[PDB]
């Protein structure tokens, strides 16, 4: 399908040291955000104690609650950068639109932690959203949800669940990455001028993972994993142009045969990362999208 004409427009306008490379990420965050900016919504900010060590959360408080599960929101960024703030024009809407509770965790990022670090830091805020949440009138069960490496942590920490006496009643995958062994015709084909590119990706692999044999491990690629029965219900949504489309389809898909329920949506024309990007009306539907599948949760 033809990009979309805004996303053509980003990509043609766009033009160091790991802290360098960090801040350029935030100000481009905080430059859409000026562009198109958040809802207000009321914030707490706190530490959750993990079993890597402390890690800070914010939680989001809608102005009218109406989800009765806790979400738990993994920020993307390759594994190194983003952070609550980055993230926060995107978890600031969910919050709203959704009427959830969010809680927006800023997990350790690489190299200076590496796999499988977050995945366990995102495991134990997870386990501590579900014991806080009858003292918020919620539902024990969690929801988590995330973007590209994010998206990668909820499905790990969604595979985990059952075994880790995790109680989840959904997760929501915004383009995720899942598959690090396997190329995919998406990741060939999109590989280079749609944002994510594979040199980067290559890097962040080097950052995050401790080995390369790492990229076999199902904590890294939850999509090598053979049992999927009994997952929790899972809203995967695409980007058309995204060299990451393939592998998130492809475990949307394998959920559905394996009885999980399952929405796969593909935003048409879309590329990488456009649920951080407000200039595109695009985030705002998937956000709506958000908010419709977990009206189905209860």
């Given at each position: 399908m033809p990009l979309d004409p805004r996303v053509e427009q980003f990509l043609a306008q766009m033009p160091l040291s790991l802290a360098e490379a960090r801040q350029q990420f935030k100000q481009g965050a905080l430059l859409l955000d000026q562009m198109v900016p958040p809802p207000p919504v009321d914030t707490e900010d706190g530490t959750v104690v993990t079993t890597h060590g402390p890690v800070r959360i914010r939680r989001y408080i809608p102005d009218?609650?109406?989800?009765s599960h806790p979400l738990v929101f993994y920020h993307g960024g390759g594994f190194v950068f983003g952070d609550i703030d980055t993230h926060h024009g995107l978890v600031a809407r969910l919050c709203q639109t959704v009427g959830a509770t969010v809680i927006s965790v800023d997990y350790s990022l690489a190299?200076?932690?590496?796999?499988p670090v977050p995945v366990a830091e995102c495991i134990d805020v997870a386990r501590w959203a579900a014991h806080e949440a009858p003292g918020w009138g919620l539902k024990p069960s969690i929801v988590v949800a995330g973007d590209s490496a994010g998206g990668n942590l909820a499905a790990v920490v969604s595979q985990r669940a059952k075994d880790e006496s995790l109680p989840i009643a959904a997760q929501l995958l915004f383009y995720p990455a899942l598959d690090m062994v396997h190329e995919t015709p998406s990741k060939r084909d999109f590989a280079?001028?749609?944002?994510?590119?594979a040199d980067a990706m290559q890097w962040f692999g080097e950052q995050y993972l401790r080995t390369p044999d790492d990229v076999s491990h199902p904590w890294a690629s939850?999509?090598?994993?053979?049992d999927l029965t009994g997952l929790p219900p899972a809203l995967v949504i695409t980007a058309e142009?995204?060299?990451?489309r393939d592998e998130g389809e492809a475990y949307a898909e394998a959920l559905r045969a394996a009885g999980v329920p399952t929405e796969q949506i593909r935003f048409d024309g879309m590329i990488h990362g456009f649920m951080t990007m407000?200039?595109?009306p695009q985030m705002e539907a998937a956000i709506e999208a958000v908010a419709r599948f977990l009206e189905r949760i209860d």
């Open positions: 009218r609650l109406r989800f190299p200076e932690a590496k796999f280079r001028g749609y944002l994510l590119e939850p999509a090598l994993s053979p142009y995204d060299p990451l407000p200039i595109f």
